[PDB]
Amino acid sequence: GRSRLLEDFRNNRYPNLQLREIAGHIMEFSQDQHGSRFIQLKLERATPAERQLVFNEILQAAYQLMVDVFGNYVIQKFFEFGSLEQKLALAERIRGHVLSLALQMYGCRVIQKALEFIPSDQQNEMVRELDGHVLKCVKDQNGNHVVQKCIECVQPQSLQFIIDAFKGQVFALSTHPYGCRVIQRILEHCLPDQTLPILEELHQHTEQLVQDQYGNYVIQHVLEHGRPEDKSKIVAEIRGNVLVLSQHKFASNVVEKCVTHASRTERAVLIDEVCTMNDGPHSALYTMMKDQYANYVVQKMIDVAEPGQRKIVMHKIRPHIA
């Protein structure tokens, strides 16, 4: 079982336990739920000498801590508050195992913390081990977190191979629960020469994407943060389909975002379309106001409809039989 020191620490025998006092017991404390938290907090404010004593004791088996549910946190604290020399030694222990670690439940968090704190050179050395394994990491439950972090942290030129790997896969990745998150990071951090081919594929498949459970969120992202040129193309896809997409579980979200983020003239054309459109025995507005999804589009159209059209809308809304 546990060492007596760790057991006593857990039983609150030592209210002032110090890092120097757990010498020889550091690997064990690091892998204990409470011993790890103790070390995590102490490293935040330990003197550099105190950090090095902890480090000298875990360096030899750092990899073992990296893939441990509690030990990974201690490794992360070193990337966060340690010296350049310690981060460098950890990077060296990581070399050749980036893929293995990225696909590991705890190791992926070590890679993320490392990317956030190491030099461009070691970031590049790490990201390059993912070459030829991009699509696998993007779709992996642990690996997608590493790819997302690379995109937020690494120089864009060093991310080109990741963009290249997405060629022709944007539709599949955008309709993936983990892949859709990677696509959103690309849109937020990459250079225009890199986002261009991605947006090109999103535009090509907008019709299908707006109806997908994950894909609609990627499209909403472009509507919320994109360039006008890109928002206009998406609005164009919704135009002439406001009625039908409004009643769709997922597409209704995109329609809503179009009403909210399209140009002045665009919002008008869309609102107009809903007033003059018909749906069998009634108007489009009629059917939409009472639909579990389409009602939100009608609401938002009000809050944004320029006074001129607002009147008109509600005018056909008067007949309140519902």
**DSSP-derived 3-state class of residue 283:** strand
CA 21 from centre of chain: 40
Distance, in Å, from the CA atom of 183 to the CA atom of 218, rounded to the nearest integer, reads 7
Q: Taken in order 144, 145, 146, 150, is the CA torsion positive or negative?
A: positive
| Nearest Cα residue to 260 out of 213, 291, 297, 208 | 297
Distance, in Å, from the CA atom of 252 to the CA atom of 274, rounded to the nearest integer, reads 14
SS (H, E, C) 65-123: HHCCCCHHHHHHHHHHHCCHHHHHHHHHHHCCCHHHHHCCCCHHHHHHHHHHHCCHHHH
Give me 150's structure tokens.
């690379």
Distance, in Å, from the CA atom of 22 to the CA atom of 36, rounded to the nearest integer, reads 12
Q: Are 291 and 246 in contact (CB under 8 A)?
A: yes
Distance, in Å, from the CA atom of 152 to the CA atom of 291, rounded to the nearest integer, reads 40
Instruction: Enumerate the β-bridge partners of residue 279.
Output: 282
Assign a CATH topology to domain 1-322: Leucine-rich Repeat Variant (1.25.10)
Q: Are 58 and 30 in contact (CB under 8 A)?
A: yes
| Nearest Cα residue to 44 out of 11, 77, 79 | 77
Burial class (CB in 10 A: 0-12, 13-18, 19+), 268: middle
Distance, in Å, from the CA atom of 138 to the CA atom of 164, rounded to the nearest integer, reads 13
Distance, in Å, from the CA atom of 135 to the CA atom of 52, rounded to the nearest integer, reads 38
Per-residue DSSP letter, 282:
E
Residue written as token pair 């489009």: 284
Q: Taken in order 258, 264, 266, 269, is the CA torsion positive or negative?
A: positive
Angstrom CA distances, 271 to 57, 254, 260, stand at: 67, 15, 11
Residues 6+ apart with CB under 8 A from 43: 19, 51, 54, 74, 77, 78, 81, 82
Q: How was this structure determined?
A: X-ray
Q: What is the CA radius of gyration of the chain?
A: 27
Q: Are 113 and 79 in contact (CB under 8 A)?
A: yes
Packing angle, helices 143-153 and 179-189, rounded to 10: 0
Distance, in Å, from the CA atom of 139 to the CA atom of 174, rounded to the nearest integer, reads 11
Distance, in Å, from the CA atom of 106 to the CA atom of 257, rounded to the nearest integer, reads 37
Q: Domain coordinates of the chain in residue numbers?
A: 1-322
Q: Which residue intervals of 175-293 are DSSP H helices?
A: 179-189, 192-204, 206-209, 215-225, 228-238, 242-246, 251-261, 264-276, 284-289
Per-residue DSSP letter, 158:
G
Residues 6+ apart with CB under 8 A from 288: 243, 246, 247, 274, 294, 295, 297, 298
Please report the resolution in angstroms.
Answer: 1.9
Packing angle, helices 294-304 and 307-315, rounded to 10: 140
Distance, in Å, from the CA atom of 211 to the CA atom of 197, rounded to the nearest integer, reads 22
